[PDB]
């Protein structure tokens, strides 16, 4: 609702791509130690990640902040991280995100 996830493609090479994610907090309360979760599309595997870490369980991808960037300030603060994937078929993007249990708007 008040949290927006921007999932953007930095680069791609047919078999894989590089992704940058920015989480924006437009609510009133700082997010102290953000985590971000989504459903990984069928054909994608995360090969490596920076400025964050992750756990893959089934279709589920759980991303955790890297500490120095753990607080997303209120009233429009952001934090960002990135990763590389491998894919086949058409490069699709997740259709939903949750940040600490809160359902996000996707921009």
């Amino acid at each position: 609702s008040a949290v927006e996830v921007t999932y953007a493609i930095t680069n791609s090479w047919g078999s894989g791509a590089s992704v940058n994610v920015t989480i924006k907090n437009n609510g009133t309360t700082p997010i102290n130690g953000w985590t971000l979760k989504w459903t990984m599309p069928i054909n994608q595997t995360i090969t490596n990640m920076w400025s964050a870490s992750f756990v893959a369980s089934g279709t589920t991808l759980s991303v955790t902040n890297a500490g120095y960037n753990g607080t997303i300030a209120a009233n429009g603060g952001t934090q960002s991280f990135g990763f590389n994937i491998n894919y086949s078929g058409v490069l699709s993007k997740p259709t939903g995100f949750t940040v600490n249990g809160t359902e996000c708007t996707v921009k």
Partner: protein, 345 residues
């Protein structure tokens, strides 16, 4: 090897991130009366290889020095003891790990009271000067922890914040220890150093009163959090863990540490934690995995206390690795803990 990689100038949080998740060689070099006196085998390189292989990237190597040193003024540490600590550290450096070396069961001399302060400082200075001097060439994958759980002794005070006096003197000892380390020069002038609160307690009283020596940005806070107490530590406490309340409560404990230190750029290592064996594998799996992900979400790197004792139904059975067999006595607990930590690949 990560033994001699030099010393970076990165923020401590980045070091803590790379430490990732750790394992204690407990009841070992910390055992009163020497390495094998509390029932563990002689430590081998093959043991540490397994720790690395399971997914741990830090070896905490607790060392009790009392019993291995001479009298004032020099408090000369036994050379064989010193070099054996070094030998074990290299088992871990050969695996490209971080290693933490502390002072551990030093309660017979390390007493946080105004009246003991002058003499304790003098001994602390000689002890750290010797340890630091021995490990001078080692790079930033070697971390010194100045003290373990400094505290007033006496059963009624065990889970308390001590007095203001105790907390004040602990801060003074941490400064004395840090300056002793740095005064040896070289990599010791720049390496990362862990310092504990009183009793390494995360309670408000003790974390609120911590003073970082010299405001040094290379200092990391050392906390021990066997949480929640009744599940994790009390042989007579509940065997179950996993309610929404359990989760919320554990979260809140880490939240206290996050808001005091981590969010302000002060890095924190949970140098000991874990659960005993109440013959409750499923509960210990749920707890271990949640602990790992909840702690990591607050930027904390947790380190399991493994004393090599894993017998179901007995107190103090934190051991999960079987050193003699080179297998895991608690494979499900270990894997869940590692799984909860996640990774960058």
């Amino acid at each position: 090897s990560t033994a001699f990689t030099g010393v970076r100038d990165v923020p401590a949080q980045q070091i803590v991130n790379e430490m990732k998740v750790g394992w204690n060689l407990g009841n070992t070099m910390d055992a009163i009366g020497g390495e094998t006196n509390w029932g563990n085998p002689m430590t081998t390189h093959a043991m540490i290889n397994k720790i690395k292989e399971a997914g741990f990237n830090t070896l905490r190597l607790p060392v009790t020095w009392d019993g291995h040193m001479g009298a004032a003024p020099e408090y000369t540490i036994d050379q064989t003891w010193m070099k054996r600590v070094e030998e074990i550290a290299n088992y871990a450096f050969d695996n490209d790990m971080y290693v933490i070396i502390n002072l551990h069961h030093e309660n017979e001399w390390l007493k946080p009271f105004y009246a003991n302060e002058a003499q304790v400082k003098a001994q602390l200075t000689k002890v750290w000067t010797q340890i630091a001097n021995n490990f001078k060439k080692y790079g930033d994958h070697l971390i010194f922890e100045t003290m373990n759980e400094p505290r007033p002794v006496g059963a009624s005070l065990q889970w308390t914040g001590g007095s203001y006096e105790n907390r004040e003197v602990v801060n003074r000892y941490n400064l004395t220890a840090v300056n002793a380390i740095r005064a040896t020069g070289g990599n010791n002038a720049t390496r990362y150093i862990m310092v504990p609160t009183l009793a390494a307690s995360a309670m408000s009283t003790t974390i609120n009163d911590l003073v970082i020596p010299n405001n040094d940005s290379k200092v990391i806070v050392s906390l021990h959090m066997y949480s929640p107490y009744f599940f994790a530590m009390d042989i007579n406490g509940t065997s179950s863990w996993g309610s929404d309340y359990d989760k919320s409560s554990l979260d809140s404990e880490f939240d206290a540490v996050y808001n005091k230190f981590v969010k302000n750029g002060r890095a924190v290592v949970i140098g000991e934690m874990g659960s005993i064996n109440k013959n409750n594998t499923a509960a210990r799996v749920t707890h271990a995995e949640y602990y790992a992900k909840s702690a990591k979400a607050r930027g904390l790197t947790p380190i399991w206390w493994d004393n090599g004792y894993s017998v179901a139904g007995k107190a103090e059975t934190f051991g999960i690795f079987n050193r003699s067999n080179l297998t895991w006595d608690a494979p499900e607990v270990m894997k869940a803990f590692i799984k909860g930590i996640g990774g960058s690949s």
